[PDB]
Design a protein around this ligand. Sequence first.
Ligand SMILES: COc1ccc(N)cc1-c1cnc(N)c(C(=O)c2cccnc2)n1
Length: 342
Amino acid sequence: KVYNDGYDDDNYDYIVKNGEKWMDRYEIDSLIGKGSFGQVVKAYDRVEQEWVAIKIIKNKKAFLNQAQIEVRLLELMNKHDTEMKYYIVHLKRHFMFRNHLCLVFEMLSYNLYDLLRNTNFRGVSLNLTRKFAQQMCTALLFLATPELSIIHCDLKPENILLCNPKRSAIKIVDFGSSCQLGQRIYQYIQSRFYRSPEVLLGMPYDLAIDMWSLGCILVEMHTGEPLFSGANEVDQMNKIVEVLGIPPAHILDQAPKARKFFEKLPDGTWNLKKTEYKPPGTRKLHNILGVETGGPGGRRAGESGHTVADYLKFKDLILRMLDYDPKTRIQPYYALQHSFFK
Ligand SMILES: COc1ccc(N)cc1-c1cnc(N)c(C(=O)c2cccnc2)n1
């Protein structure tokens, strides 16, 4: 009939009303986002005199506990990321308000998907992509801090916001799926398009799964379309094999879900199970980026900083991020030393 004395709807969300004033501080403007966790609203903090994004967690134990995990990680990064120099969204504050946990973040701009949609999904320049690549590798280096060792676990263009629509700075948001390194508890993780092979294959994983997501994300930012846009896990792996080929046998010989996608023939080698797709490794990233044809779709012909030399340095870094072996995959410190950033 009525939930939380009328403050919540039937699925535990707080009914947001534009113009409401919380605790004589926050002036709720409008709803800017929704999710399984709850809602995100645009509000004006009057003590600090600034716009803020408030994350109102649903009035439900499951989502309340998931948010305290998120708060513990965010505050743990504030102890290390003083002055906010590592491109992580800053948690300012949190409080309870009418049985909902509220998290106050800095008011950020559009996400990288919004930006891509406004190119009609054909990408931004390689010079801007380099600016995002350097900032993302730097944030991943921060999460790699030994005392942190944080896996974001859901990197994707929507989880990366611009600070100011007039500036090329980006921030990583939404650490509700995030966990610190440790013994394996979850296996169905990451967004599918950006899910690493060790996750698809049911193998142990570490912080290197975020480096895989980045490689897919960076290519997507320049071409406009997801690199591996699988409609399911079988389709996903098949689109990975198109570009990178069959994974190594010493990995597949260990993968618990190897046979969900592959088959071992009598001769001891692995091949794709029949389900369409190009032969393994013939959708070359060289051609996807259009290294020698003027970029994706030839749309970058004649633009400065889009030479074959530049594309070859971008391709090399990406291929280091899309390494099948998570122990060989490039690490943030090394990625930042790459020639693509000189
Ligand atoms: C345009 O910005 C958004 C659009 C949709 C949604 N759902 C959220 C945002 C947005 C804007 N500013 C923010 N600071 C944030 C977040 O900090 C954020 C995003 C996802 C999950 N938790 C916090 N999120």
